[PDB]
Structures are given as structure tokens and as C-alpha cells.
Amino acid sequence: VLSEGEWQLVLHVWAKVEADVAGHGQDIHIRLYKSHPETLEKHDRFKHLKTEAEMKASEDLKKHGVTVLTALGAILKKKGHHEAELKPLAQSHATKHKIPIKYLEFISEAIIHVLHSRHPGDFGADAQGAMNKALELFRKDIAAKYKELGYQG
Ligand code: HEM
Ligand SMILES: [O]
């Protein structure tokens, strides 16, 4: 649904994330947990972290951020052909972690906020539009996989 040109913008900005995976991971999760504190209760391994300082001091959270962004980066680089990458993710998030689709909108907001926060120059109107479209397709496809697993999250 994205043009080849929009995908180049998504991957261009993604390389900036890859220059600091762990720092982007942290900032996205702190944003997620600070703005949507109910998501913290679904991150049972992190729910004891109540302050942004406790969160930034958690090397465990920092590691998880790398795991999330690494997985998300692999999806974005497939330019929409991510069936195989989304399958394990939908399986675990729908059946094991029980993360609703709405929480994916929340982390999507957080990703975009952090990207603009760190790269206001490269992440302009067009890049934001493309990244929003890419994250939108990601949630759309993963919601379809949720239903196929019988969980509508
Ligand atoms: C872009 C969106 C997301 C991506 C790419 C992502 C990716 C991952 C990956 C790769 C794992 C480890 C393997 C697995 O169990 O599937 C994981 C674990 C997990 N994710 Fe997600 N995730 C996303 C969003 C979320 C959100 C919004 C939550 C809400 C709290 C969440 C909750 C969890 C939990 C609870 C685990 C298990 C961690 C543990 O207890 O060790 N995920 N995620
Ligand atoms: O995650």
C-alpha cells in the first residue's frame, strides 16, 4: 500500500534507529509506559518499573527494546512482504502475552514520537507519513493474524 518511494523513507529513518538500537528501544518503551500505564501491566517482567529513571536504569528493559526494534526492523525491511515475520509475533502476542491490538497503536505512537524526537530533521512530514503508513500496515496485517488464531485482541 506504500510506494517504493515511501519505503525508502521508512528504511532511511530506520538506519538511524539502527545506529542506536538500545537507546531508541528504551525511549520508545518509556514513552509507551509513561503515556499508557495500563500497558505496563501487560509487560509483567517490567511492571515493577514505576519511574522513568527506574526504567532507563533497567538493562533488562534496554535488552527487550533491542529485541522489539530488531524484530520490527526485519518487518519494515520486507516492505510489506512480512507474512513470515508477523506469524511468530502474532502467535506470541495474541496467545501468550495477550497484548491487544490497541497496544500496538500505542507503541506505534511511541515509535513515531521517539523518531521525531531524535531525528527532527530527517523525520519530516514525508518520512512521518511513510512511517505511519508502514506501522499502520503492520497493525492491519497483525490484526488479521490475531483473528486467524481466534483471538481478536
Ligand atoms: C512493534 C510492536 C512489537 C514488536 C515488534 C514486539 C516484539 C517482541 C518480540 C520479538 C518479543 C520476544 C519474542 C516473543 O515472545 O514474541 C516480544 C516479547 C514480549 N512482548 Fe512484544 N513486541 C511489540 C509490542 C508489544 C507491546 C506493545 C507490548 C505491551 C506491553 C508487548 C509485550 C510483550 C511481552 C509481555 C513479551 C514477553 C517478554 C518477556 O516476558 O520476556 N509487546 N515482543
Ligand atoms: O515486546
From Swiss-Prot:
Which positions bear Phosphothreonine?
Answer: T67
By which gene is this protein encoded? Answer: MB
Which PANTHER family is this protein grouped with? MYOGLOBIN
Where are its TM segments located? none
Query: Where in the cell?
Result: Cytoplasm, Sarcoplasm
Q: What is the effect of changing G121A?
A: In metmyoglobin
Record domain Globin: where: 1-147
One GO CC term of this entry? sarcoplasm
EC?
1.7.-.-, 1.11.1.-
Can you name this protein? Answer: Myoglobin
